[PDB]
Amino acid sequence: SNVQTSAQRDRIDLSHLGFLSGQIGRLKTVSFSPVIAGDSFELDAVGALRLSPLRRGLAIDSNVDYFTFYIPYRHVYGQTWIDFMKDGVNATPLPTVTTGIDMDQTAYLGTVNPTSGIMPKFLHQSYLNIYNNYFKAPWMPDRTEANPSNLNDADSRYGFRCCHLKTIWSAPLPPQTEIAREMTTGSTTIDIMGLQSAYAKLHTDQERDYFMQRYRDVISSFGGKTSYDADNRPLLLMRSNFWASGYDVDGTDQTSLGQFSGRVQQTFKHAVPRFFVPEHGVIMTLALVRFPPTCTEEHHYLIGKGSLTYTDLAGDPTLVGNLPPREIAMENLFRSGGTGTDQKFKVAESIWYRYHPSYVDSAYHLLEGFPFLQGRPAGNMTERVLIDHTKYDSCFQSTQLGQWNAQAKFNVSVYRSIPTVRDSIMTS
Amino acid sequence: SNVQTSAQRDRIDLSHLGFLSGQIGRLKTVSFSPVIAGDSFELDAVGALRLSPLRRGLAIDSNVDYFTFYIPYRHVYGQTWIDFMKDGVNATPLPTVTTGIDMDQTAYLGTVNPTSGIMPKFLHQSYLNIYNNYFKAPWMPDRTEANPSNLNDADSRYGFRCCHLKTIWSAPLPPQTEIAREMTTGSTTIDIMGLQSAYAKLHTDQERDYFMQRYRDVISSFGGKTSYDADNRPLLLMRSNFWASGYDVDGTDQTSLGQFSGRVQQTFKHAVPRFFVPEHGVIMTLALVRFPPTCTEEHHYLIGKGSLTYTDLAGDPTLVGNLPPREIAMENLFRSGGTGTDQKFKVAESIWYRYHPSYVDSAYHLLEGFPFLQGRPAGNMTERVLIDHTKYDSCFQSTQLGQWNAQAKFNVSVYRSIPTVRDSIMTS
DNA sequence: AAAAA
DNA sequence: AAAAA
DNA sequence: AAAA
DNA sequence: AAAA
């Protein structure tokens, strides 16, 4: 009888609750919401973050980060998505990915794993794109797992391991750093105009080692700019950063009179400005919890080197600003550090005059309840930069909620051109 | 000695002259200029357009169009361009295309053909992208010639054939237009809720036949928008439209006392607003000359049908707005028109009450000097919409400059971060 | 932006 | 946006 | 007339 | 000091 061809703008409420938990230094999705082209989106999240109960009182605060991204479906499917919308009703169904059989094999995607073992691929593919563009180190290779079932238990359960806060050892110079550059002069002659050309080519190589390892960085150096559709990267909408604090509880019985237990409870807000959605896609929110990288057995570089030369100590501007980067070992910074090839990296020529490390007294070593890196970070450069959550197990009491937990309410309001429920159920 | 690492913004002059010629209704490149990321570009073209001398006086003015487009190199090379800029000095040279051996095998690209037979592919590939996105009919297939040498003599010498100005026969309904839609009702029963669903699916199919045959049109119907990098299309900067006029010259000798000769000479301006160049690429300018599509042996539809029914003549709003599109033949509009399958197309139900054709008296038939389509447009629908320049040969006197010629000065001013000539030649 | 400026 | 508000 |  |  009466065929409907259009719809008014209606206020849709997409608010819901979230019960979240995770580990230290792993990225995990906490909320998502699919969107349609032409929508007007707004988000506001309010909740409280908690850590597991501590073995002692409060010593060090933790840092919490919240992120929101928008990913069009065209970035995930490509040409398949283009033909999908042009065909219309008789379009081919989109491809899928395979998941595991347990209930928690997709916890990093913020959803319960369906019993069928099959789910759409836009959440898994959007997670990889975010990680490879914003969170991993620029010099390490991308993650290219095809299906969620290809991950190990740790990655699927809690998320991918992220990088420590920047220090001398956790933010070294990239591995493709050269300390020498050779030329092909003659046996008894040299071209000096050719020498000038050699320095010019070395300058462009050093630019791409320190600043420009991505395509959008190269364009930015010329003074241009690239849209997020040019390099197929997710669009960041909002970032929030805050510190979590709490209070202490005192024991009052015979045995525990004089000891204390700390609990962390912090309220937060994550507000995203109004956004106009240009195409069909998804909007995802993620969280990250980290501690400042304090190590017990770390000392000053001048203390660790022992025998000091004029270059080390004088701080002469002519020598500091004209020498190639120096290669140092982990032994020079940590007790029992290594000397082999895997314990070697390169730093600035006088970096020790621009920072001072933190000191932990030997009375605090091997003491439960203090969030510390006991000893030194182990492994090669890749394992040294990435955070390992199992090293923080000595700070918390064993519980089923991991190392941190939160409860938040996401206030989502969208203006959508969709027919009402009454229109959908009445034939005439 | 002294190595330079930066440069000031300098005013570069890229002005040059152009001597242009072509045929009626063929797209041809008249100017181009490569650009660098971060540039500030501005263009202003001033010149005069001429036609070949006419066999008689001035009767009909012609229409001239000028276009300017910007095409990044990333649209032409894709991932190859991305790796080119990330590698730096030691990058692999870009691929090339093969050209012909004659001097005029690349005239449609606005350049003289080099004697080596090899040229970069960014001009040829940018020309195809412009034609497939803005000039061909939406329902005809794309042009995908790999090399300039794969074209025929006519296309390479003058350009691709474009479409006539919109009329009843030159702008028909797309060939994928249906006049019926079937359902699968029962032998003695019908579902009426299923009938409502059938109309909904028919509406979406008709939307994609009349309005949305490109991806960016589908997104626009939802109320969203797509950048030119999403569908990899050229960016239009400016369009100019004007008519060309002239005057007449009188003969004064014994034989030609009383006859006249018309010449067309029109000055024009094509100004492009200041543009910020975001990436490396090229900026191209093209021209198009067309005549209004007047045919000698064309008559009214009511005259050609002969026997008139109530639906044809009454103009009743209920019948006009509720009937499927009607299929008519070329015989109903042109003398000696066809009736076979290739001379059939579909129009609106009462299109003849919304326009009136032009009348040419029989005294003007087969008379040299008048720009007309003698008789009818021949061929199938594809050949009927595209303009054929050989039909206008009877209007001009034979000359080496084709059917139109022009002489213009392009004022190009760009702000570029490039070192001076003195910096480039002095070592210190 | 085909339809006098 | 790690570095009291 | 529907957000009955 | 260069746009000598």
Q: What is the DSSP string of A169-203?
A: TTSPPPSS--S-------SS---HHHHHHHHHHHH
Closest CA to B384 of B356, B355, B344, B349: B344
- Method used to solve the structure: cryo-EM
- Measure the CA–CA gap between B70 and B35, rounded to whole angstroms: 10
- Measure the CA–CA gap between A402 and A214, rounded to whole angstroms: 36
- Measure the CA–CA gap between A216 and A226, rounded to whole angstroms: 6
Question: How many Å lie between the alpha carbon of A349 and the closest alpha carbon of chain B?
Answer: 22
- Measure the CA–CA gap between B98 and B119, rounded to whole angstroms: 7
Single-letter amino acid code for the residue at A263: R
B-chain CB neighbours of A208 within 8 Å are 86, 88
Cα-Cα end-to-end distance for chain B: 6
Q: Are A32 and A282 in contact (CB under 8 A)?
A: yes
Which residues does B contribute to its contact with A (CB < 8 Å)?
Answer: 1, 3, 5, 36-38, 74, 82, 85-86, 88-89, 192-193, 196, 199-201, 203-205, 208, 212-213, 215, 218-219, 222-227, 229-231, 277-279, 417, 427
Buried b (16+ CB within 10 A) or exposed e, A369-386: bbbbbebbbeeebeebbb
Single-letter amino acid code for the residue at B171: A
Q: Are B268 and A268 in contact (CB under 8 A)?
A: no
Q: How many residues appear in chain B?
A: 428
Q: What angle do CA A323, A326, A329 make, to 5 degrees?
A: 170
A-chain CB neighbours of B199 within 8 Å are 3
CA-only gyration radius of chain B, Å: 27
- Measure the CA–CA gap between B289 and B268, rounded to whole angstroms: 14
DSSP per position, A254-265: TTTTT-EEEEEE
Closest CA to B169 of B27, B304, B319: B304
Cα-Cα end-to-end distance for chain A: 6
Q: Residue B400 phi/psi, 5° resolution? A: -80, -15
Question: In chain A, after which residues is the C-to-N distance over 2.5 Å, breaking the chain?
Answer: none
Question: Using the beta-carbon criterion (under 8 Å), do A86 and B215 form an inter-chain contact?
Answer: yes
Quick check: helix, strand or coil at residue A226? coil
Torsion of CA A298, A302, A307, A311, to 10 degrees: 150
Q: Are B70 and B280 in contact (CB under 8 A)?
A: no
Closest CA to B72 of B275, B233, B273: B233
Question: Using the beta-carbon criterion (under 8 Å), do A225 and B85 form an inter-chain contact?
Answer: no
- Measure the CA–CA gap between B419 and B207, rounded to whole angstroms: 55
- Measure the CA–CA gap between A131 and A234, rounded to whole angstroms: 10
Closest CA to A269 of A13, A48, A31, A26: A48
Q: Are A413 and A42 in contact (CB under 8 A)?
A: yes
Resolution, angstroms, 1 dp: 2.6
The chain A residue lying nearest B198, using CA atoms, is: A3
Q: Are A29 and A384 in contact (CB under 8 A)?
A: no
The kind and range of the H/E element at A67 are strand A62-72
Question: Using the beta-carbon criterion (under 8 Å), do B88 and A230 form an inter-chain contact?
Answer: no
- Measure the CA–CA gap between A143 and A128, rounded to whole angstroms: 7
Question: Using the beta-carbon criterion (under 8 Å), do B277 and A224 form an inter-chain contact?
Answer: yes
- Measure the CA–CA gap between A96 and A357, rounded to whole angstroms: 50
Closest CA to A37 of A74, A91, A78, A92: A74
- Measure the CA–CA gap between B385 and B162, rounded to whole angstroms: 8
Question: How many Å lie between the alpha carbon of B88 and the closest alpha carbon of chain A?
Answer: 7
- How distant is C1' of E2 from CA of B224, in Å? 29
Helix, strand, coil fractions of chain B, as percent rounded to 5? 25, 30, 45
- Measure the CA–CA gap between B302 and B316, rounded to whole angstroms: 16
Query: CA neighbours within 13 Å on the CB side: how many for A38?
Result: 14
Q: In A182-315, where does DSSP find H-type helix?
A: 192-210, 215-222, 301-305, 310-313
Which residues pair with residue A242 across a beta bridge? A64
